[PDB]
Design an enzyme around this catalytic site. Structure first.
Site, PDB file in Angstrom:
ATOM      1  N   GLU A  22     -19.321 -17.194 -34.057  1.00  0.00           N
ATOM      2  CA  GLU A  22     -19.293 -18.196 -34.840  1.00  0.00           C
ATOM      3  C   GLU A  22     -18.707 -17.692 -36.159  1.00  0.00           C
ATOM      4  OE1 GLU A  22     -19.235 -21.170 -34.661  1.00  0.00           O
ATOM      5  OE2 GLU A  22     -20.502 -21.466 -32.639  1.00  0.00           O
TER       6      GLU A  22
ATOM      7  N   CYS B 147      -6.277 -39.790 -27.254  1.00  0.00           N
ATOM      8  CA  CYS B 147      -7.479 -40.966 -27.067  1.00  0.00           C
ATOM      9  C   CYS B 147      -7.514 -41.649 -25.864  1.00  0.00           C
ATOM     10  CB  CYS B 147      -7.084 -41.739 -28.392  1.00  0.00           C
ATOM     11  SG  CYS B 147      -6.562 -41.175 -29.918  1.00  0.00           S
TER      12      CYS B 147
ATOM     13  N   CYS C 188     -10.080 -39.923 -24.061  1.00  0.00           N
ATOM     14  CA  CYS C 188     -11.227 -39.460 -24.810  1.00  0.00           C
ATOM     15  C   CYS C 188     -12.310 -40.095 -24.108  1.00  0.00           C
ATOM     16  CB  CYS C 188     -10.845 -39.873 -26.248  1.00  0.00           C
ATOM     17  SG  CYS C 188     -12.454 -39.494 -27.618  1.00  0.00           S
TER      18      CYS C 188
ATOM     19  N   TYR D  10     -22.311 -24.703 -41.574  1.00  0.00           N
ATOM     20  CA  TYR D  10     -21.897 -24.673 -40.170  1.00  0.00           C
ATOM     21  C   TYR D  10     -22.471 -23.557 -39.559  1.00  0.00           C
ATOM     22  CZ  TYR D  10     -19.123 -24.004 -36.084  1.00  0.00           C
ATOM     23  OH  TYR D  10     -18.564 -23.550 -34.987  1.00  0.00           O
TER      24      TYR D  10
ATOM     25  N   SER E  96      -3.526 -16.441 -47.707  1.00  0.00           N
ATOM     26  CA  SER E  96      -3.940 -18.113 -47.787  1.00  0.00           C
ATOM     27  C   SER E  96      -3.490 -18.269 -49.246  1.00  0.00           C
ATOM     28  CB  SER E  96      -5.373 -18.330 -47.595  1.00  0.00           C
ATOM     29  OG  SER E  96      -5.738 -18.393 -46.447  1.00  0.00           O
TER      30      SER E  96
ATOM     31  N   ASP F 224     -17.891 -28.225 -38.624  1.00  0.00           N
ATOM     32  CA  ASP F 224     -16.759 -27.583 -39.038  1.00  0.00           C
ATOM     33  C   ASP F 224     -15.535 -28.320 -39.791  1.00  0.00           C
ATOM     34  OD1 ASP F 224     -15.725 -28.489 -36.769  1.00  0.00           O
ATOM     35  OD2 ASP F 224     -15.351 -26.412 -36.033  1.00  0.00           O
TER      36      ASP F 224
HETATM   37  S1  SF4 Z   1     -12.335 -39.533 -30.980  1.00  0.00           S
HETATM   38 FE1  SF4 Z   1     -11.133 -39.740 -29.136  1.00  0.00          FE
HETATM   39  S2  SF4 Z   1     -10.386 -41.992 -29.253  1.00  0.00           S
HETATM   40 FE2  SF4 Z   1     -11.337 -41.478 -31.435  1.00  0.00          FE
HETATM   41  S3  SF4 Z   1      -9.412 -40.604 -32.410  1.00  0.00           S
HETATM   42 FE3  SF4 Z   1     -10.131 -38.735 -31.598  1.00  0.00          FE
HETATM   43  S4  SF4 Z   1      -9.353 -38.554 -29.704  1.00  0.00           S
HETATM   44 FE4  SF4 Z   1      -8.786 -40.860 -30.405  1.00  0.00          FE
END
Ligand code: SF4
Ligand code: NA
Length: 348
Positions: free
Chosen positions: A37, A199, A202, A120, A296, A138
């Site tokens: 970690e 997504c 997801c 974290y 950085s 994080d």
């Molecule tokens: S959690 Fe899943 S559905 Fe929501 S923005 Fe992120 S990738 Fe897209």
DNA sequence: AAGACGTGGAC
DNA sequence: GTCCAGTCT
């Protein structure tokens, strides 16, 4: 008003299928969790894996790390970056050995008292190794949560993080907090990517406000980083008749702390300014290379000057006389690792 | 709060 | 070039 169980089940089920077989995931030992970690802080997984393997081989237990020399740990961390991390960790395990007997504290307040351990790390290490249900937020989780719940707060302010942590408290699966926490991090690493998030793949697309509104690609909210200073640096590579090389250990406070380096000055007349510093007996040639190296918060603009070394006294600390055959043992920053590479190429 | 604090990878 | 992969102060 969150369908928490529906989200939890889809996330946790997806994590079991897609979980990467990472080295620190072979078990739930706190020391090995704690080492990984810390290493993973601001560092990509692919970068860490080899450092973790060499490190754990050299320091297989908390006691091995605490019992090791400070320079032995720094060499194992050489080139990883943010070296205060390892110095803080080396101290922290020493405290755990003496104060807690070598058993990593399971109490958030007790573990958070240790150096280099912040919110974290308390959540990450204690949730995975011991099951403590502390959030592990994080930068990746803050992006995931800022999309699941359409939060526009700047993820830079510590307060914005505090809100996300409170969000985790309510949506957490207190049933298996460790698996819940690492599912968010794995989701952030594999699915809810910083750019071009996938997504459609997801597991929690339905429960995500940002995807609904079509703005996941426009999150998280973060201020543009302040432009970095530029710092000219003059570097001396000095050799005597026998091919030994002058190197010096940097101070234990500040930039590249306790790292060895070829002597340098922040010359904002480099050859003269280098030659003045050394007097406190040698002469330098014209420069052989100039290259940049990024931090950085600043950028070094280095210029390497070859030079000959005539011994008029003992080489007193912090400087040390190092044969070319022995330089491989010391821990140098990448900047001065490149100084040496360019120096030897010129010699050819 | 926001600067200090390394290095490398993907755009 | 930009952005991303936490803790101390
Ligand atoms: S959690 Fe899943 S559905 Fe929501 S923005 Fe992120 S990738 Fe897209
Ligand atoms: Na702490």
């Amino acid at each position: 008003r969150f369908p928490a169980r529906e989200f939890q089940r889809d996330l946790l089920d997806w994590f079991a299928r897609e979980r990467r077989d990472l080295p620190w995931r072979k078990d739930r030992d706190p020391y090995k969790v704690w080492v990984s970690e810390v290493m993973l802080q601001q560092t990509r997984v692919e970068t860490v894996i080899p450092y973790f393997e060499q490190f754990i081989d050299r320091f297989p237990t908390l006691e091995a790390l605490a019992d090791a020399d400070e320079d032995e740990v720094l060499k194992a961390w050489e080139g990883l970056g943010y070296y205060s991390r390892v110095r803080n960790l080396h101290a922290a395990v020493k405290e755990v050995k003496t104060r807690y007997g070598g058993k990593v504290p399971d109490d958030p307040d007790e573990f958070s008292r240790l150096k280099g351990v912040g919110p974290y790390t308390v959540g990450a290490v204690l949730s995975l190794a011991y099951g403590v249900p502390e959030p592990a937020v994080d930068g990746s989780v803050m992006r995931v949560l800022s999309r699941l719940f359409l939060v526009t707060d700047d993820i830079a302010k510590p307060s914005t993080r505090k809100r996300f942590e409170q969000i985790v408290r309510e949506i957490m699966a207190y049933e298996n907090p460790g698996a819940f926490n690492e599912a968010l991090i794995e989701l952030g690493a594999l699915v809810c990517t910083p750019r071009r998030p996938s997504c459609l793949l997801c597991p929690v697309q339905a429960y995500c406000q940002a995807f609904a509104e079509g703005v996941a690609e426009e999150l998280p909210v973060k201020m543009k980083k302040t432009a970095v200073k530029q710092v000219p640096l003059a570097v001396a590579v000095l050799a005597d008749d026998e091919g030994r090389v002058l190197i010096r250990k940097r101070d234990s406070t500040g930039l590249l702390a306790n790292l060895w380096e070829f002597p340098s000055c922040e010359t904002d007349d480099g050859k003269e300014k280098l030659e003045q510093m050394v007097g406190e007996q040698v002469e330098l040639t014209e420069p052989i290379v100039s290259f940049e190296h990024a931090f950085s918060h600043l950028v070094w603009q280095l210029t390497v000057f070859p030079g000959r070394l005539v011994h008029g006294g003992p080489v007193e600390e912090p400087y040390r006389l190092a044969p070319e055959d022995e330089l491989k043992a010391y821990a140098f920053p990448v900047s001065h690792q490149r100084v040496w590479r360019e120096y030897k190429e010129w010699a050819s």
